[PDB]
Amino acid sequence: NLQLVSELKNPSGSCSVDVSAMFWEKEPCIITACEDVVSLWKALDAWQWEKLYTWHFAEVPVLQIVPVPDVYNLVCVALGNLEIREIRALFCEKQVLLKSGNIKAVLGLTKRRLVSSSGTLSDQQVEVMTFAEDGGGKENQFLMPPEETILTFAEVQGMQEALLGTTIMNNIVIWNLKTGQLLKKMHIDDASVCHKAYSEMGLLFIVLSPVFQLIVINPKTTLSVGVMLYCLPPGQAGRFLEGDVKDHCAAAILTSGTIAIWDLLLGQCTALLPPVQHWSFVKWSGTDSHLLAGQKDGNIFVYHYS
Structure with missing residues (x-):
């Protein structure tokens, strides 16, 4: 299941729209995307992230x-x-x-x-x-x-x-x-x-x-x-909003606001992640076994998946 292991606060002018974990020349980093700014972040310690680089976008906003x-x-x-x-x-x-x-x-x-x-x-x-x-x-x-x-x-x-x-x-x-x-x-x-x-x-x-x-x-x-069919647990609302899969795990943000995870092989919903405002996007890490959950106000929470 899911243990919160690190978090990134990234309060900008603009709405946060995406996140990605990648290696950068080689070390694991996180990229954040808001409508008007993109940033590269590296681990400061066991739970904190520091900004290493920023790119800016006037006129046309970042989509993903x-x-x-x-x-x-x-x-x-x-x-x-x-x-x-x-x-x-x-x-x-x-x-x-x-x-x-x-x-x-x-x-x-x-x-x-x-x-x-x-x-x-x-x-x-x-x-x-x-x-x-x-x-x-x-x-x-x-x-x-x-x-x-x-x-x-x-x-x-x-x-x-x-x-x-x-x-x-x-x-x-x-x-x-x-x-x-x-x-x-x-x-x-x-x-x-x-x-x-x-x-x-x-x-x-x-x-x-x-x-x-x-x-x-x-x-x-x-x-x-x-x-x-991958379905939500007994008495859980509501519908798919956005999602991501890596290997054989699927993660979705539901219109309700909660994040649900499934094992595509096991068939089962292996986790519910309620909001800590509403979850805005979810992405699996491309570097390791972490889930990245973001809110519109820029905060990213990183969960270890077991």
Whole structure:
């Protein structure tokens, strides 16, 4: 379960919107994102965090952090008011504009890659850029577009070089990341947002946001059934608001204001985390076995998960 082990107070002018734990060149750090400022933090002692660097954003507000596997020398953020307008890389005033326009979906991938999609149909583009060791935009690879607006990406764990997307048509698509080709398009019995995709034994396992749901799909027959429902404990309100998965644990913020955790394998709700104002976002740490819970006023609480 969950033991509070450290906390970060970060009171800025603006609303806090995201948090991420990453290694920085290499030591575990936390990145905080508020609408108008992003900061890198390092452990001061067993429970306190100190600010090491800050980046500022006038005009267009920060929407989210975009963690990128295997990258330890920059922080990627997406900026916009509702839809993404920009994607920037932040280096330790040192911002590089990476992508600009009508961006629909974005995700960091293994091996220093970042995939994004823009446009909606015949004009849809899906692009995977690669950062060089020095953080520089090095390559860009276009992926065969489904011509259906992508809602989310998920890198398929257990399948070599496969990327999954969900589309507004309630379809999933799978790309071969080596060739750019679209491998399959599959209707999910008419969710939406995919928090995680796994592959084993020819089967596809996708976790979707009955807070969470796991659907298992046979890509060969296209036949798919819900086969795990993750639901709140006896007498607990209410509904999914936002969430995050790492490995086989899912964490969600509920509209009520409480945080709930599940073991995706065990099927069970392994923890409720009531507010210490309301929880605003939740993120698993990318460095260790910690849960990061944040409030809008800037405070982040860090829990050890056992």
